[PDB]
Design a protein around this ligand. Structure first.
Ligand SMILES: CCCCCCCCCCCCCCCCCC(=O)OC[C@H](COP(=O)([O-])OCC(O)COP(=O)([O-])OC[C@@H](COC(=O)CCCCCCCCCCCCCCCCC)OC(=O)CCCCCCCCCCCCCCCCC)OC(=O)CCCCCCCCCCCCCCCCC
Ligand SMILES: CCCCCCCCCCCCCCCCCC(=O)OC[C@H](COP(=O)([O-])OCC(O)COP(=O)([O-])OC[C@@H](COC(=O)CCCCCCCCCCCCCCCCC)OC(=O)CCCCCCCCCCCCCCCCC)OC(=O)CCCCCCCCCCCCCCCCC
Ligand SMILES: CCCCCCCCCCCCCCCCCC(=O)O[C@@H](COC(=O)CCCCCCCCCCCCCCC)COP(=O)(O)OCC[N+](C)(C)C
Ligand SMILES: CCCCCCCCCCCCCCCCCC(=O)O[C@@H](COC(=O)CCCCCCCCCCCCCCC)COP(=O)(O)OCC[N+](C)(C)C
Ligand SMILES: CCCCCCCCCCCCCCCCCC(=O)O[C@@H](COC(=O)CCCCCCCCCCCCCCC)COP(=O)(O)OCC[N+](C)(C)C
Ligand SMILES: CCCCCCCCCCCCCCCCCCCC(=O)O[C@H](COC(=O)CCCCCCCCCCCCCC)COP(=O)(O)OCCN
Ligand SMILES: CCCCCCCCCCCCCCCCCCCC(=O)O[C@H](COC(=O)CCCCCCCCCCCCCC)COP(=O)(O)OCCN
Ligand SMILES: CCCCCCCCCCCCCCCCCCCC(=O)O[C@H](COC(=O)CCCCCCCCCCCCCC)COP(=O)(O)OCCN
Ligand SMILES: CCCCCCCCCCCCCCCCCCCC(=O)O[C@H](COC(=O)CCCCCCCCCCCCCC)COP(=O)(O)OCCN
Lengths: 536, 33, 438, 127, 83, 57, 97, 120
């Protein structure tokens, strides 16, 4: 029963991408959503069996996947509470994205290949989450990396999309290299790759740094966030999957599965990434970019909370699962707005008659991001902010990030709906089928269920804080939202420009790192092999 | 736009070969290659 | 073993008696018969015989032949990859040269005598000079490079073999001999240094590969580079272990430098064949270092990675040859829109390039993991150095794929039925090894 | 219309090419781009590397000020008004083993010095 | 620390293991966390309304423990002379 | 005029002032709250007679 | 330009194809063409669904044989209906069910 | 100012400065409502100095306005999607005809396909 979900996704991938000539566009519009629905039924069974009823299961497919001398690893799947929760969230979001793609990608030539890549992408994410050993996780990590390369660069005749895919691939190579080094350290000194025997009470700092460096790649933290903003070249369904669940979450999942992180580093890196991402999102004028910077900020919050307390891992995973739903909703709604208006710029959006479902889903997702009380996003974010009070540095930065988050989120909501119409007087239209309505029904259902069921066991446990300190996140969010509605100026033009250039990390890489890389290549080749050592 | 006859479950509008596999042209009378 | 050797001797023999019009058919059938004989040799090789599975002697120390773990894998790889080379080559002259080269190489792998090893491997010296220097599509410079580099390295190896034969009285591997001499170790080592391209003795390889025919390039990358690992495991580590341990800091410096400089040089390449050639040079460094550690994990990892390369590099060279036949260009700048224009060629190209980058479902991943584990067994820094610099391979491969993937093109340049037939065995073998049937 | 939109084709090369022309990516559509944007040519927003560095110089102190206080100026005794969570002896001893744990900062404990030395552990494996 | 002695531990090792209580949660309030955990998992979606008595009791015990921790801190600080 | 048609209150001076005051108070309070909150938490125990008889009088 | 003779064998433009969009119809891709919609798609999809259900049956058999639960579930689990290796549930207190 | 702008005559330079300033007003605005007052302000700014005849003062004004328009260049220009610099530019470019397709490729001299070694 547990294997079935992975089978359904890989089957949908093979069918759509190898037998699409027979199935057709309509055949992929059937087999994709059907397989994802079946996988949702299996994931729901897994979630009930493991999470609610505390029944972890291990399925060993085969032994001796790698058998060289002492080194021995097997392909085995352990469904633990973290795996069940992530499997459920991933499959729910993927099923929604598959339903969404039926209408969105009708205007794209390869809808069969797109559906195939989406299902293979979901399968590799489930392999990463459910792996019982570090090698299976690496298999999933690389599979999602390759699927992202094949999906971001889907538009090959655009130089920006191919460059965005190359950027993703290179950054992910650097990260998985650090991970491979850490896995080698852990195998050598613990004797196994299985997480049960992997447990080490005291680990040398080197392994901790290598683990963190590996994780900061997929979960785009500071210095490694360049690829996320660029990943906007790909079609909207890809962005929803990568940002909401498949890619950003993997780093957090790795850090939570093996608690080798160092408190000092994770807190500072997280709080910095939260603030920087919020500031970058303030300057952004593309709808899809703002939601990416919001993803960066939220990832910063999840990374930061690990430092605060022992329950930080539970709080981080709880935020991760709460975030995937609303963030997916934000991307799908942004895509539909872009499709309906033929515009990507916030300036040209405005009030216009539309579907009630889409406008409500956008409002509720934005409210969850903002932190509106009595919402799934609110509980998962307050759990972090309240517990971070002990670390004075992390708390102050995270509150400032909450303010900036509220400001941009409110500005975006005002610009997309409240603001008067800003596009031209030309005939534009995108009619929504019942499949899109089902997709939004699924996202809203996830959002509602999250409030009733919660995200962590310790979510509502009392944090012994004065009332003024416990309710401050709300006041900061409200103040930011009010300032964002008024569309006031917060920073001087020098800083607004700085934030628009994203801190100039990419300008540094191009002017110095890329030039050094190609000078090393020039010395290695032109000066030496084909110069000094080449005959006349 | 929409579906060809307004129904999703209708026969495909394309009759013929989507492409030539390996670049080979089908024999007119159905003679095997 | 006897069946394999007999089939090997029959394949060059068959050409003398064929009709000159049936040459290609006979050569293909002989290649398949040699593959089947290799499978029989594998069947008749019992794991119970831990040291050497089978040893045969035909009256002298020179005619002593035997199969071990390294020898068995390399011989099976040569027999698997030869049919592809055969079908890709046309003409009696070309067939004769290729069949003689293959017979010499396949006899070298199973040889257990250093002098016989030298006699068989270096017999195919003029044939490569003539093949790489062919009238219209060949370069005399590349032929001279490969020939001179081979002659100098093999002559040094020969001098070391003569000293070992004088001092011990025999040069057969089956007789346990140990030597602490550094001159003799260097003599044996220099051959390995040149044959498996290691900086700064790697210049001969790219020239030869670019100006060789596709059958020649496939054979060269697929198995000719591997002949170094057979010499290391069979003729160097047993006798000159002390010198490898004495020089380990230098060996590591030269191997890592080769990996780095080759990776950086691959970045400045505009020709697809040169890109594949420099990728091979970079990949050889890990195999050489892993074997030099003289550990179980290293010898197994090196042989496994060699098989993975011997399955991934012929695929890329085959696809490059097919593309060149379709377009008469190897410049990445002229080739654009290949995704839209050749969806079937593109799929296989992307798959093989993913294999070259050591992704998990490919044999390269397992092999790399084992080799890195062996390096980590030696020192953690040794492993880290290799793991970090692997990104350079990604940068060049990504740039190439991106340039080829999109653009505007007015030519439909896709593979024919013959081209798919030629890569299907390589694809299936890659998949099978990737899933763990190494 | 997503598919079939008009595009401008890049003009064919008509002059001797520079040696380092591989730095330019041209697929045949008119707007070709550098291999890495910002390496050369027009810079986004007309902002040089010097401008970005001056910005980071202005920003860095303000961002680092919260972190430097608690981490360096503050001490375990004064960081928080309470002690770390109190556990039974059997639970506490096991929890103290974890280097990345939160019970190692309990000054009240008579094993504080050992726990503090455990927290500041080895940089690299000794063997 | 000595002035404010630890409370008696109602939960035994066997009970904490049987309820699958992690080590971090074994902090003198484990019996109440066992009650809350059993009720929350028993009512998967309705726990927020139904399981409120157990949460209240846990929060109260946690409050008392927090007050003890602050008292211990103040006593240590006075012993060192800082305040 | 920011949102004349839909939400004209934003342009009103009172709204701008109230929003700015909320921003100021919340942001400055976030920094200052650490000292203030830590004081209310130390004081809660120190002035409780059962926990500390000496301070109470 | 007079369409080549083979053009009769090739398929027409599908309903979903935008009228302005021009693509070469001779190119073959395994994933399908530019807009597909082949005749006989309904049968192909039914065959696909049957192969999916058969493979699901095989996967279910394999998983059930290899699913090892070594710790008793806290309460009743759905796996009991189909798999007989589930340990008898024990609750939080410890009572067997 | 770039070389192409500098070569332009005075009249074309001022027209270009007005055009660019209006586009930058659009880029820095949050809605169409902001554009109208800002565009009227820009118009008044140009109208105020239009009757100046002193060449030196005119040069100073032009140079300063060019420096202002260089500094205030937006990181994200507001460009229509279908135009160069737009998201949908090049997504599925229209294929040109006259494509060279080789029919039955493997059946052209099937037995003798391969590479030959020519010798002297
Ligand atoms: C590392 C640090 C940086 C590396 C270099 C930095 C500066 C280098 C300084 C040296 C230099 O400038 O060399 C240029 C110079 C060539 O002159 P040129 O200006 O290039 O043009 C002249 C020709 O007409 C050129 O006409 P051409 O274009 O037709 O000829 C080109 C030719 C010209 O090439 C050569 O002639 C020499 C090629 C190899 C030189 C060997 C070492 C030189 C530098 C190593 C140490 C440098 C540290 C300083 O290149 C080749 O094709 C041959 C190379 C193919 C074989 C590859 C083998 C490589 C071996 C070592 C590579 C060098 C190390 C770099 C990579 C590191 C990897 C470990 O090369 C030499 O003269 C060699 C210098 C040392 C030779 C070794 C000692 C000789 C032993 C003789 C003993 C006497 C015996 C007495 C008995 C005699 C009776 C028989
Ligand atoms: C008992 C019952 C009966 C059952 C049968 C059992 C009998 C057993 C053996 C009997 C088989 C007949 C032997 C064949 C004799 C003639 C062969 C020949 O002429 O070759 C080309 C000839 C093709 O003739 P063609 O196409 O009509 O045109 C040639 C024209 O005459 C001129 O054309 P061109 O001017 O355009 O020249 C172009 C040239 C391009 O120019 C070059 O490349 C020159 C390169 C110099 C030599 C190549 C150096 C490397 C050769 C390595 C040896 C190959 C085997 C590798 C195994 C390693 C062995 C250590 O390319 C070639 O000629 C072919 C390239 C590769 C062939 C080279 C191999 C021949 C080596 C010596 C041949 C024997 C001649 C002895 C003379 C006897 C009285 C005069 O025959 C072949 O089919 C290919 C060669 C077959 C090699 C088997 C011969 C044994 C040699 C291996 C040495 C082992 C020791 C001997 C023991 C053998 C068993 C006891
Ligand atoms: C042009 C192509 C068009 C056609 C496409 C073909 C579609 C291929 C389908 C993909 C295959 C996926 C199956 C992956 C498992 C590989 C099957 C296998 O290796 O058989 C195993 C038996 O194991 C199985 O059958 C696995 C069950 C397969 C299906 C179960 C769930 C399916 C979901 C896919 C997830 C698999 C993740 C594994 C990642 C490593 C052999 O058993 P042993 O005797 O132990 O062999 C020794 C082990 N070793 C190979 C290392 C030497
Ligand atoms: C792990 C257990 C089960 C494993 C199943 C894996 C999922 C399916 C794997 C199928 C084969 C793996 C690799 C297929 C060949 C690689 C080429 C490829 O994937 O795509 C080809 C073409 O695709 C195919 O024809 C075959 C794809 C069928 C299924 C692919 C699913 C996604 C691949 C999985 C990634 C492989 C994992 C390797 C590392 C873990 C090229 O696509 P583009 O470069 O994007 O250009 C297409 C044109 N356009 C511009 C419009 C986008
Ligand atoms: C300090 C380093 C700290 C962390 C290091 C991680 C990343 C370092 C540099 C990231 C380079 C990866 C980005 C990339 O691959 O994308 C380039 C591809 O660039 C290249 O391939 C050039 C090679 C760069 C890769 C390596 C250069 C830097 C090497 C680092 C140190 C150099 C040597 C040190 C040791 C070898 C495409 O450029 P864009 O225009 O920005 O594409 C984005 C899409 N859009 C058009 C929409 C903007
Ligand atoms: C139904 C038809 C199925 C169609 C496709 C399936 C094809 C085969 C599928 C399964 C067969 C697997 C055999 C492939 C190679 C496995 C070799 C192997 O692992 O055994 C080694 C034998 O020693 C040796 O020396 C063996 C040498 C020969 C192996 C092949 C050498 C490469 C030839 C070309 C590659 C193609 C491979 C296919 C010793 O294994 P061990 O001692 O290391 O311990 C094992 C743990 N690692
Ligand atoms: C006690 C002794 C003291 C030391 C004294 C040393 C004195 C000299 C020793 C040098 C011996 C090395 C022999 C190689 C000479 C270089 C090659 C000749 C250069 C050359 O022009 O060859 C052309 C092509 O060669 C090529 O294309 C080959 C390129 C270069 C070959 C690289 C050499 C192999 C690797 C070198 C060392 C490797 C390990 C060393 C242990 C063919 O010219 P042509 O046919 O047109 O004739 C027309 C006349 N110009
Ligand atoms: C500068 C860096 C070195 C470059 C080599 C890098 C990596 C190569 C390592 C190869 C591994 C095995 C080879 C064994 C030794 C070769 C080089 C080792 C380094 C070396 O030169 O040591 C020398 C001794 O070696 C010797 O006495 C023999 C040196 C090699 C001879 C050169 C040509 C020989 C060709 C002979 C052909 C066949 C002859 C067979 C009879 C002197 O070191 P030391 O111990 O005196 O320390 C005194 C310092 N204070
Ligand atoms: C919150 C955690 C921190 C996140 C990021 C913090 C980064 C802080 C580092 C910047 C602050 C110190 C900068 C050094 C002082 C330089 C002051 C003026 C700079 C200058 O004059 O030259 C520049 C050197 O580039 C440079 O300044 C490069 C030096 C940067 C050191 C490497 C640190 C990584 C930087 C990554 C992001 C920083 C983006 C902007 C630096 C531009 O040189 P030129 O191109 O005009 O020369 C002409 C080409 N012949």
């Amino acid at each position: 029963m547990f294997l079935l979900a992975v089978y359904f996704l890989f089957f949908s991938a093979i069918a759509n991408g190898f037998f699409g000539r027979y199935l057709g566009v309509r055949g992929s519009q059937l087999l994709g959503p059907s397989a994802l629905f079946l996988a949702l039924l299996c994931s729901g069974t897994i979630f009930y069996e493991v999470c609610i009823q505390g029944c972890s299961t291990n399925i060993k497919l085969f032994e001796n996947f790698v058998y060289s001398n002492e080194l021995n690893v097997s392909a085995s799947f352990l469904y633990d509470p973290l795996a069940a929760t992530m499997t459920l969230t991933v499959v729910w979001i993927s099923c929604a994205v598959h339903a969404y793609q039926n209408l969105y990608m009708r205007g794209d030539g390869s809808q069969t290949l797109f559906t195939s890549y989406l299902s293979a992408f979901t399968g590799f994410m489930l392999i990463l989450v459910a792996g019982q050993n570090l090698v299976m996780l690496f298999i999933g990590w690389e599979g999602i990396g390759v699927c992202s390369y094949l999906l971001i660069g889907y538009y090959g005749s655009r130089v920006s999309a191919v460059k965005s895919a190359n950027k993703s691939l290179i950054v992910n190579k650097i990260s998985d290299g650090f991970l491979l080094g850490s896995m080698l350290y852990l195998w050598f000194y613990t004797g196994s790759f299985s997480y049960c025997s992997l447990a080490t009470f005291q680990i040398p700092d080197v392994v901790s740094i290598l683990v963190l460096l590996g994780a900061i790649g997929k979960s785009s933290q500071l210095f490694f966030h360049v690829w996320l903003a660029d990943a906007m070249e790909g079609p909207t369904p890809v962005s929803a999957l990568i940002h909401a669940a498949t890619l950003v979450t993997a780093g957090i999942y790795v850090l939570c599965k093996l608690n080798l992180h160092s408190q000092s580093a994770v807190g500072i890196l997280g709080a910095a990434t939260a603030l920087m991402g919020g500031l970058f999102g303030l300057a952004a004028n593309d709808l899809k970019r703002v939601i990416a910077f919001s993803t960066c900020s939220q990832l910063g919050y999840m990374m930061a909370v690990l430092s605060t307390c022992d329950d930080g891992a539970d709080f981080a995973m709880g935020h991760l699962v709460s975030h995937a739903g609303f963030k997916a909703t934000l991307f799908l709604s942004a895509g539909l707005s872009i499709a309906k208006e033929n515009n990507n710029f916030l300036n040209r959006y405005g009030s216009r008659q539309g579907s009630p479902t889409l406008s409500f889903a956008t409002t509720i997702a934005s409210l969850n991001l903002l932190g509106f009380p009595e919402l799934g996003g609110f509980y998962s974010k307050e759990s972090i902010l309240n517990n971070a009070y002990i670390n004075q540095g992390v708390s102050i930065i995270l509150t400032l990030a909450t303010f900036l988050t509220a400001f941009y989120t409110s500005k975006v909501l005002a610009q997309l709906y409240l603001f008067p119409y800003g596009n031209g007087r030309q005939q534009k239209s995108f009619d929504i089928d019942a499949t899109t309505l089902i997709c939004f029904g699924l996202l809203l259902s996830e959002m509602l269920l999250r409030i009733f069921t919660g995200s962590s066991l310790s979510q509502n446990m009392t944090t012994n804080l004065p009332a003024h300190i416990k309710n401050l996140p709300f006041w900061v969010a409200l103040s930011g939202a009010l300032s964002g509605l008024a569309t006031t100026n917060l920073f001087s033009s020098n800083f607004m420009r700085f934030f628009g250039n994203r801190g100039g990390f990419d300008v540094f890489y191009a002017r110095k790192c890329s030039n050094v890389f190609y000078h090393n290549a020039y010395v290695s080749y032109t000066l030496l092999d084909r110069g000094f050592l080449k005959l006349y | 736009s929409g579906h060809p006859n307004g129904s999703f479950w209708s026969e495909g509008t394309q009759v013929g070969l989507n492409g030539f596999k390996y670049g080979e042209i089908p024999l007119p009378n159905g003679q095997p290659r | 073993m006897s069946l394999y050797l007999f089939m090997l001797f029959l394949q060059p023999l068959s050409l003398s008696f064929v009709s000159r019009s049936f040459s290609k058919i006979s050569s293909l059938m002989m290649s398949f018969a040699t593959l089947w004989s290799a499978v029989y040799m594998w069947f008749t090789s019992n794991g119970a015989n831990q040291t050497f599975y089978q040893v045969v002697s035909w009256g002298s120390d020179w005619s002593t032949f035997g199969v071990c773990y390294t020898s068995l894998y390399i011989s099976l790889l040569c027999a698997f990859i030869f049919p592809i080379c055969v079908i890709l080559v046309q003409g009696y002259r070309a067939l004769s040269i290729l069949i003689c080269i293959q017979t010499a190489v396949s006899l070298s792998i199973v040889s257990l005598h250093m002098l016989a090893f030298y006699a068989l491997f270096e017999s195919s010296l003029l044939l490569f000079f003539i093949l790489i220097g062919r009238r219209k599509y060949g370069s005399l410079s590349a032929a001279y490079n490969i020939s001179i580099y081979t002659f100098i390295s093999a002559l040094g190896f020969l001098i070391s073999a003569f000293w070992l034969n004088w001092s011990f009285g025999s040069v057969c591997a089956l007789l346990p001999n140990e030597e602490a001499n550094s001159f003799v170790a260097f003599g044996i080592f220099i051959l390995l240094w040149v044959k498996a391209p290691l900086v700064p003795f790697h210049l001969w390889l790219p020239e030869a590969h670019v100006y060789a025919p596709t059958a020649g390039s496939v054979l060269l990358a697929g198995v000719l580079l591997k002949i170094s690992i057979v010499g290391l495991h069979v003729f160097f580590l047993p006798i000159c272990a002390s010198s490898i341990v004495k020089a380990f800091p230098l060996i590591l410096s030269i191997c890592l430098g080769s990996f780095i400089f080759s990776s950086f040089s691959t970045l400045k390449q505009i020709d697809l064949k040169k890109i594949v050639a420099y990728s091979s040079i970079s990949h050889m460094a890990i195999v050489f270092l892993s074997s030099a550690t003289n550990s179980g994990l290293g010898i197994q990892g090196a042989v496994l990675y060699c098989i993975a390369h011997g399955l991934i590099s012929p695929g890329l060279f085959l696809l490059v040859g097919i593309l060149y036949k379709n377009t008469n260009t190897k410049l990445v700048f002229y080739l654009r829109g290949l995704s839209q224009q050749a969806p079937v060629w593109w799929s296989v190209w992307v798959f093989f390039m993913l294999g070259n980058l050591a992704f998990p479902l490919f044999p390269n991943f397992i092999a790399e993991v084992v080799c890195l584990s062996a390096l980590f067994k030696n020192h953690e820094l040794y492993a880290y150095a290799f793991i970090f610099f692997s990104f350079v391979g990604t940068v060049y491969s990504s740039t190439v794929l991106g340039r080829l993937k999109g653009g505007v093109s007015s030519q439909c340049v896709d593979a024919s039925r013959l081209d798919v037939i030629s890569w299907n065995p390589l694809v299936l073998a890659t998949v099978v090894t990737g899933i763990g049937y190494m | 219309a997503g598919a079939g939109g008009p595009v401008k084709l890049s003009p064919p090369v008509d002059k001797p090419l520079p040696y380092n022309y591989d730095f330019w990516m041209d697929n045949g559509i008119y707007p070709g781009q550098p291999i890495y944007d910002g390496m050369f040519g027009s810079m986004v927003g007309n902002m040089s590397l010097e401008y970005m560095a001056k910005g980071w110089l202005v920003l860095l102190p303000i961002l680092s000020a919260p972190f430097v206080y608690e981490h360096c100026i503050a001490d375990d005794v004064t960081r928080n008004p309470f002690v770390p969570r109190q556990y039974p002896s059997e639970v506490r001893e096991f929890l103290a083993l974890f280097k990345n744990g939160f019970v190692l900062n309990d000054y009240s404990q008579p094993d504080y010095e050992e726990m503090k030395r455990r927290q500041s552990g080895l940089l690299t494996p000794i063997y | 620390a000595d002035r404010f002695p630890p409370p008696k531990m109602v939960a035994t090792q066997e009970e904490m293991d049987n309820a699958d209580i992690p080590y971090k949660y074994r902090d003198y309030c484990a019996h109440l966390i066992i009650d809350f955990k059993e009720c929350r998992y028993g009512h998967p979606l309705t726990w927020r309304i139904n399981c409120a008595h157990e949460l209240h009791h846990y929060n109260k015990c946690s409050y008392i423990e927090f007050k003890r921790r602050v008292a211990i801190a103040i006593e240590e600080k006075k012993r060192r002379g800082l305040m | 005029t920011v949102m004349a048609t839909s939400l004209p209150i934003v342009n009103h001076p009172a709204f701008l002032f109230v929003a700015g005051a909320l921003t100021g108070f919340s942001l400055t309070y976030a920094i200052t709250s650490h000292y203030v909150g830590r004081k209310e938490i130390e004081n809660l125990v120190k002035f409780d007679p059962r926990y500390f008889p000496e301070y109470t009088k | 330009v007079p369409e080549p003779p083979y053009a009769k064998y090739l398929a027409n433009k599908s309903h979903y194809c935008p009228p302005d969009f021009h693509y070469s119809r001779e190119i073959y891709a395994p994933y399908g063409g530019y807009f597909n919609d082949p005749k006989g798609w309904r049968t192909n999809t039914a065959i696909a669904t049957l192969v999916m259900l058969a493979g699901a049956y095989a996967v279910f058999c394999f998983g059930n044989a290899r699913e090892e639960r070594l710790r008793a579930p806290k309460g009743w689990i759905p796996s009991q209906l189909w798999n007989d290796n589930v340990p008898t549930p024990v609750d939080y207190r410890g009572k067997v069910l | 100012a770039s070389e192409a702008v500098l070569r332009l005559p005075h009249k074309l330079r001022v027209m270009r400065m007005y055009r660019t300033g209006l586009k930058e007003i659009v880029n820095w605005s949050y809605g169409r409502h902001e554009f109208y007052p800002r565009a009227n302000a820009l118009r008044m700014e140009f109208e105020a100095n239009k009757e100046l005849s002193d060449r030196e003062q005119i040069r100073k004004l032009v140079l300063h306005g060019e420096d202002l328009l260089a500094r205030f260049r937006h990181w994200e220009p507001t460009i229509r999607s279908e135009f160069v610099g737009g998201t949908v530019y090049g997504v599925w470019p229209q294929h040109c005809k006259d494509v060279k397709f080789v029919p039955n490729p493997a059946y052209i001299d099937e037995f003798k396909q391969g590479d030959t070694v020519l010798l002297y």
